[PDB]
Design a protein around this nucleic acid. Structure first.
Lengths: 60, 57, 170, 165
RNA sequence: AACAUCUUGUCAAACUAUGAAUAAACAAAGAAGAAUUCUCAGUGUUAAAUACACUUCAGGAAUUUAAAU
RNA sequence: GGCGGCACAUCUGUUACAAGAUAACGCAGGUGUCCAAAGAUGAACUCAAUGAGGACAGAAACCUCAUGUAGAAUAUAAGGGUAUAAGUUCAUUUGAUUAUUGAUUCCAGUACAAUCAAUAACUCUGAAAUGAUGGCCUAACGAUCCCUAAGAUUUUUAAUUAG
RNA sequence: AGGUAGAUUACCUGACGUUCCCAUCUGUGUGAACAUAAUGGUACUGAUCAGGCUCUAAGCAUCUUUACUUCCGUGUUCGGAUGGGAACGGGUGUAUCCUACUUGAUAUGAACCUACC
């Protein structure tokens, strides 16, 4: 009862029906694994800007 | 500032007086007098331009 | 002002090698005579390939030492003197070196004992000219020019002009 | 039937270029990579540590992170029926700056050179220059007249067959 | 004879200097269609920075602008 | 079908078609190991082979010069890599360590396993930049349950003095 | 012109000979001390009596090599396409892409910072 082992036949036709799904833009903007110092620098400014924005809200 | 260790100076053994003597030429101004006490021509051979300039040890 | 002074031959290295097929006891005696003749401890050469025909790897076969300066010249004089300043024309290498072998080492003759024994020694002399250091130094190593390099006939002429030892062609 | 080793079928891919063995340039370790740059991943088999997978060889990616010794490169990988984003950290030995935007970055500078003169010609009131014409595929050549003074004719005909032997 | 050396005839899926055609993956203007000028902050790098890096090319204001196979 | 073999977990060259994938009981072979050094680092040196010389010594013992792009060596199969080294010699050493992250290979984008990039300790080598979280790279291996080892003092509480 | 550090890594290499050195570089003298080895040969340090002998560098050659260009040659091979031809084997035509080896001509480095001449 030997059988055919493998074939790539019809595989490209199948893969192109619903064509190659591209990744979304948000996939290229991930930050995990970035430089430790650059993350430390970015977080410091974001905290500074947010705290300065919030005191303006309290003022007005 | 240059990174280093004090294990490859003229001291790295004995003490700062051994390093200070070499920096000030004590080793140089001890072979001039050693050669003088051994041979006059040997003295003129190695330090010939020092007598010409009159630089005493 | 001629630069011939920069072209004067001078014996820069003289290697004396004693080869014995066994290690231990007799090797120490072979190293002992070398120390007396020169004044520095020799180096015991060990075998590279073990061959049962010669009954020899890690075992030390031969000992040798090299001398330079006035010591090499005076040691070489004894070797040529005991050779009667007779050197064959085929002993001189194409690179300007030469050598020979000595059967009986004179060393000491009064108190020769079987404990010391008798040993055969070979003398190999390496000739050089000023400026050969460019191939020996650590920084900016190069090759000496062919015209500056020593050939066979310069070595042969030097032996005739420094020791008056004729050459043998037969 | 191949095996499934990490560096299978790499006799010729990982072989160094002819007469190109040994140490590499110092421009490889001195080039400055900034986030957003375009680089080409080139597996240098002379350096076995950190060797990128052979499937990324010759692919053009973008720098997304810069670390003290490695450069974060981002490439697109084709999977069953989708494309995924692969984020590698490769030492500068195995990457190389890409010229994929060489022509584009010149056209960017050419239009900015004209734009610089435009903001100055507007102050003086003179007409302002137009932006460079866009690239087009080879267009049909126009009608041109050929002078007969320096013309020569050579007849072209089928050739009589001659046996090579 | 053998060894060098200059030629000659014919070869390689597990030989190769060289090396296509067909191909693979990029770019051809999305922190949201450009650019410029002025102002400009937080961290850090730095000998120190006004350099540099990231921060919606931090942010803010004017002018120009829909062009880029 | 059985007997044989293992194409059942697995690595290399090729078939194989210059991206990736990729068949046959296709071809030529390999693994279940080995290493306190054959791991880490620093320094010095250059290998195979050949030519010419030197008592015994000769085709092969050891010494010297010259040429020497690796034709040697690198634990092993094969293929890659390597020359002021990744080979040889010498010296010090244990980073073949603890803790926390984010990725790449196989991939169902599961586990195991392997490959990296960083951070916090404590170290080793070196003058120093650096390098070191096993072996120059591609194989050298293992879930649930059960058994058996190691670890949970960095700090938090209570009672009684003094305020 | 020379020296230091370089980047490109043969247009830079290899062999045969030639040309200066005024500074610089190199080769050059010595071994007391740091340090070194069987050897002051190397590496180390102290120095300046001599020298362009070598190195380095500049140039020579119907020089090997290497590097560009033509040619090789639209010849090898190749993507697409017949109710095209052939018993097979293999080989057209059409719309296209198009190497390599060889040979011949040319070249034998360009170029950055600092100092000194």
């Amino acid at each position: 009862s030997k059988d055919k082992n493998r074939s790539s036949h019809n595989q490209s036709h199948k893969a192109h029906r619903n064509g190659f799904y591209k990744p979304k833009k948000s996939a290229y903007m991930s930050t995990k694994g970035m430089n430790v110092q650059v993350l430390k620098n970015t977080k410091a400014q974001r905290k500074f800007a947010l705290a300065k924005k919030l005191e303006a809200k309290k003022a007005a | 500032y240059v990174p280093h260790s004090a294990t490859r100076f003229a001291g790295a053994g004995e003490n700062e007086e051994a390093l200070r003597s070499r920096i000030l030429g004590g080793h140089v101004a001890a072979y001039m007098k050693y050669l003088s006490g051994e041979d006059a021509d040997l003295y003129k051979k190695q330090f010939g331009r020092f007598i010409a300039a009159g630089i005493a040890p | 002002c001629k630069s011939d002074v920069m072209r004067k031959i001078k014996i820069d290295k003289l290697v004396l090698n004693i080869s014995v097929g066994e290690s231990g006891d007799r090797l120490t005696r072979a190293a002992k005579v070398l120390e007396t003749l020169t004044g520095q401890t020799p180096v015991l050469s060990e075998a590279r390939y073990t061959v049962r025909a010669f009954s020899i790897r890690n075992d030390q076969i031969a000992c040798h030492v090299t001398v330079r300066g006035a010591k090499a010249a005076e040691i070489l004089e004894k070797g040529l003197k005991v050779k009667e300043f007779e050197l064959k024309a085929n002993n001189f290498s194409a690179t300007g070196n030469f050598g020979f072998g000595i059967e009986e080492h004179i060393d000491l003759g009064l108190k020769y004992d079987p404990q010391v024994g008798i040993y055969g020694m070979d003398f190999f002399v390496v000739l050089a000219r000023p400026g050969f250091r460019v191939s020996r130094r650590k920084r900016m190593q190069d090759k000496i020019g062919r015209d500056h390099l020593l050939t066979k006939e310069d070595a042969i002429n030097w032996f005739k002009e420094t020791y008056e030892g004729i050459v043998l062609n037969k | 039937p191949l095996s499934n080793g990490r560096n299978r079928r790499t006799r010729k891919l990982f072989k160094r270029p002819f007469r190109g063995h040994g140490l590499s340039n110092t421009s490889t370790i001195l080039h400055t990579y900034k986030v957003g740059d375009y680089v080409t991943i080139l597996c240098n088999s002379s350096i076995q540590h950190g060797l990128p997978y052979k499937a990324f060889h010759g692919k053009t990616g973008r720098v997304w992170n810069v670390n003290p010794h490695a450069i974060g490169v981002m490439v697109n990988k084709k999977v069953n029926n989708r494309i995924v984003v692969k984020r590698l950290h490769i030492s500068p030995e195995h990457i190389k700056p890409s010229g994929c935007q060489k022509d584009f970055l010149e056209r960017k500078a050419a239009v900015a050179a004209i734009r610089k003169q435009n903001i100055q010609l507007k102050k003086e009131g003179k007409p302002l220059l137009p932006l460079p014409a866009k690239r087009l595929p080879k267009q049909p050549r126009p009608a041109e007249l050929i002078k007969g003074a320096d013309i020569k004719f050579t007849t072209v005909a089928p050739l009589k067959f001659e046996e090579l032997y």
